[PDB]
């Protein structure tokens, strides 16, 4: 087991992982924009009449209602997931406390400080 070579290997793996994850998130944002264009179709009104706006606003109200209801449900799901995340974070934190917290302290905080003056 080398030390300097392995350290360089691990830090290079870390840097490559970080850069690849950044590029993957950029790809995710691009795909998000693609999905946004696809589903929520672009609506052009370059010189159109009133009935076009009437239909557009009617579809707007329908889609706004349905999407707000759906996102209300999704937000309820996200709140439940946040509750689960907090509970499991408490669980894992208590596990770590049981495993290692008693081992955490200031040993020889002053015992080594005071040696022979007594």
């Amino acid at each position: 087991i080398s030390a300097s070579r392995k350290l360089q290997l691990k830090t290079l793996m870390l840097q490559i992982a970080k850069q690849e994850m950044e590029r993957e998130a950029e790809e995710r944002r691009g795909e998000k924009g693609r999905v946004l264009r696809t589903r929520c179709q672009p609506l052009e009104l370059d010189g159109l009449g009133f009935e076009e706006l009437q239909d557009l606003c009617r579809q707007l109200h329908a889609r706004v209602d349905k999407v707000d209801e759906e996102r209300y449900d999704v937000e309820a799901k996200v709140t439940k997931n946040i509750t689960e995340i907090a509970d499991l974070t408490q669980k894992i934190y208590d596990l770590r406390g049981k495993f290692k917290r008693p081992t955490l302290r200031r040993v020889r905080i002053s015992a080594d400080a005071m040696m022979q003056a007594l």
Binding site: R105, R106, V107, R108, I109, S110, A111, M114
Partner: peptide, 10 residues
């Protein structure tokens, strides 16, 4: 006796 967080009593 000793302060909390050390290894041995002071």
């Amino acid at each position: 006796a000793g302060f909390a967080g050390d290894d041995a009593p002071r």
